[PDB]
Design a protein around this ligand. Structure first.
Ligand SMILES: C[n+]1cn([C@@H]2O[C@H](CO[P@@](=O)(S)OP(=O)(O)OP(=O)(O)O[P@](=O)(S)OC[C@H]3O[C@@H](n4c[n+](C)c5c(=O)nc(N)[nH]c54)[C@H](O)[C@@H]3O)[C@@H](O)[C@H]2O)c2[nH]c(N)nc(=O)c21
Ligand SMILES: C[n+]1cn([C@@H]2O[C@H](CO[P@@](=O)(S)OP(=O)(O)OP(=O)(O)O[P@](=O)(S)OC[C@H]3O[C@@H](n4c[n+](C)c5c(=O)nc(N)[nH]c54)[C@H](O)[C@@H]3O)[C@@H](O)[C@H]2O)c2[nH]c(N)nc(=O)c21
Lengths: 22, 242, 126, 235, 124, 23
């Protein structure tokens, strides 16, 4: 009944840290 | 990642890299061992073939021996070592001439897909069903027996001793018989199940280096099959005209 | 009838204080919410198994937070909201960056609950 | 968790009413059918999770539990306004889904077979599943056990030896099968992450007073314990 | 032989500069190191599949960092060290809080290489 | 030889790593 996690919108860019390696 | 690191590297810079990456900076314990030094030379060769030649295809395809030759001349530190352990390194290069292997290249009806097998441990990579020969064993019965054990299939009905790709790879004589016409509905199961992880069909044109159109990635996952791709394609082309 | 709703809040607040004594009052309630968490490594949304009634609460320290009484297991969710910028409204969801930099996604079963709760959160942190 | 290890029974009913009943949507508030589902969810929550933290809390059938929850909060009294037994009558004759499985014990009757799903939230449980149309109760247990553990119990299952349990809106029947070899090689035919033997005395509430993730296991521990005792005395 | 290291040091610095032009000098070397990274939220250490020779380098801007030439893939690791406090030594390992708040774990094959380089980090 | 498994790695400094998602 709850939507699948796939449809959830992308978070703000500054809320997600950059990947481990540049 | 690092997939652009060698696209503009000259072959001498490539040799510079492989030296610093594998040979020059080893523990004093590991430099003393001839066996581990031989191990690093082949690891460098594997790196060169699977990764450095994925980028920059102009670089030459070299077997282990010719690669070792190019590495020894480029690295005079290795040239001193190569001379003292002459005989040991020559045995490291040619010991597979005593271990022949036979197998099959199983093709579907359109000769567009082939059967590959994979093992769990390390980076085994995809390869054709193959294995060592026995005293009480013919070439055909080696390939047949080896195919049944790890794919569960009986090719005795369709094998042709006249149709094969015979190659020499790292000193080792490898002959794979070409068995087309196998149904894609065939359900595969391994008798030596505790050694084989997967049995899957692959579209040949999806395999690395099979076409000039380069999707060249995962070359380190199909290192065994690549030497056979060019003669297989010529063989398929000749049979199609028949 | 009005008296019921004072009694509903009384039972609700007694339950919340039983799990979380520092809670002082219930600002608002959402009938049912599902909880999602964003994995910064996979960089995808994943579904948690936390689902149930959503209570917006104020604690003794005047902090704003929400409790979710999980209907699937005894493990509830109690998260504070420290800053307006850490809660956004995107499409049908509430996305919340927690104190520990985790990213939560709230989906409310009633869309009117989503819009009302998000504006009462704005008015509570000012 | 520990949130219930020191709660009175009244405080437990308080929690279950706010967690499941009191704060429902308007329509889910409006139907007897919708309330029963929430009461059955609450009853399962109490039997599966709360009693594990505090086996001093008594194990209760669905109907007795619902009666004590109903008498606990007068906000539900609107539903038995004209007929008091109405909600019990609905619970009592409601047609639920039949699920069948087995409790497989070793020869010494001190270990049992449990299955776990892939998710971290998934807990250990007995192999069981919902019945197919026209499938007999025994064929369903045989099929479910073999589909989840890869073991065929069709030659040792006793159709007269089972535990019935109405829980979470399901009519669950687990057949008891003892004497299974600990050498039995388990594998899943499916969904199932692993099959493992557990010691019965390591399961929550099986010990008299000794308070970790199990689904629909604890409610069977008391009737299974009696079953093993009766057979133990007999032998 | 001293002549031996003159070409070994020359090739190493020549290789590092090919991947990282700003490299100016090699401070110290470790024969073999494995890299681990701690996964936040998961609260676990992960295998990074970065493994090989460890070069402690000084930058064109005089910055301190380390390059690890990966033996398993062309993906190398080049991370700068901002403060002695950003590298700790815990039970034969070096744990490093990188510029981007990631936490890496360094495992050295030779403990004398391990501690020797760690004392060189405590300066600068 | 090969490198130790990630399991034996000690826990990092408490103040360098954020707390788990839920207390
Ligand atoms: C070193 N050594 C061993 N021995 C004695 O004989 C026993 C084992 O001998 P094998 O050397 S025939 O063993 P294996 O290679 O493990 O079996 P496979 O051929 O089925 O495995 P693939 O990996 S499919 O190799 C096939 C061809 O491709 C090359 N290869 C292999 N890998 C992993 C890669 C790769 O990652 N990337 C690339 N590009 N190529 C790769 C592989 O070299 C081969 O050419 C041992 O137990 C010993 O008893 C020896 N005996 C002597 N006298 N000297 C030795 O040095 C030796
Ligand atoms: C509290 N509880 C309930 N239940 C059962 O639920 C039934 C009623 O319906 P629900 O809607 S409440 O069902 P639910 O069982 O709770 O959902 P899920 O999240 O477990 O279901 P996936 O969507 S299939 O998620 C799992 C995914 O993980 C994938 N995965 C991951 N790995 C590492 C692998 C791998 O290595 N190999 C494979 N093949 N897959 C892997 C996987 O693909 C899947 O996609 C009621 O009747 C209840 O039966 C429970 N059941 C149990 N056992 N414990 C509980 O606590 C529980």
């Amino acid at each position: 009944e709850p939507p699948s996690p796939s449809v959830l919108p992308k978070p703000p860019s500054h809320w997600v840290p950059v990947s481990f390696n540049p | 990642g690092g997939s652009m690191s060698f696209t503009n590297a000259t072959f001498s810079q490539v040799l510079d890299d492989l030296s610093a990456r594998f040979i020059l900076n080893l523990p004093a314990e590991e430099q003393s061992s001839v066996e581990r030094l031989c191990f690093q030379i082949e690891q460098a060769h594997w790196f060169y073939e699977d990764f450095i030649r994925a980028q920059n295809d102009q670089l030459p395809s070299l077997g282990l021996r010719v690669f070792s030759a190019k590495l020894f001349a480029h690295c005079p530190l290795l040239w001193k070592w190569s001379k003292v352990h002459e005989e040991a390194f020559d045995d490291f290069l040619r010991y597979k001439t005593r271990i022949p292997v036979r197998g099959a290249i199983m093709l579907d009806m359109s000769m567009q897909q082939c059967v590959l097998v994979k093992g769990w441990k390390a980076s085994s990579g995809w390869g054709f069903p193959k294995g060592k020969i026995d005293k009480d064993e013919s070439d055909v019965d080696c390939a047949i027996r080896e195919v049944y054990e790890e794919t569960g299939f009986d090719c005795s009905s369709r094998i042709n001793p006249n149709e094969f790709i015979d190659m020499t790879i790292r000193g080792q004589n490898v002959r794979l018989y070409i068995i087309p016409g196998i149904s894609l509905d065939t359900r595969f199961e391994s008798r030596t199940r505790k050694e084989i992880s997967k049995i899957e069909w692959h579209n040949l044109m999806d395999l690395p280096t099979f076409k000039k159109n380069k999707p060249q990635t995962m070359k380190n996952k199909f290192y065994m099959v690549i030497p056979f791709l060019a003669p297989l394609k010529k063989w398929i082309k000749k049979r199609n005209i028949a | 009838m009005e008296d019921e709703n004072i009694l509903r809040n009384a039972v609700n607040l007694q339950v919340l204080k039983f799990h979380y004594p520092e809670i002082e009052s219930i600002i608002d309630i959402a009938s049912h919410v599902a909880v999602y968490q964003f994995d910064v490594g996979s960089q995808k949304w994943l579904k948690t198994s936390i689902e149930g009634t959503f209570f917006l609460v104020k604690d003794q320290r005047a902090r704003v937070g929400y409790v979710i009484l999980n209907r699937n297991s005894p493990e509830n969710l109690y998260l504070f909201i420290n800053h307006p910028s850490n809660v956004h409204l995107v499409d049908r969801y509430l996305i919340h960056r927690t104190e520990n930099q985790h990213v939560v996604g709230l989906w409310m079963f009633d869309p009117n609950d989503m819009s009302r709760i998000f504006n009462i959160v704005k008015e509570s942190l000012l």
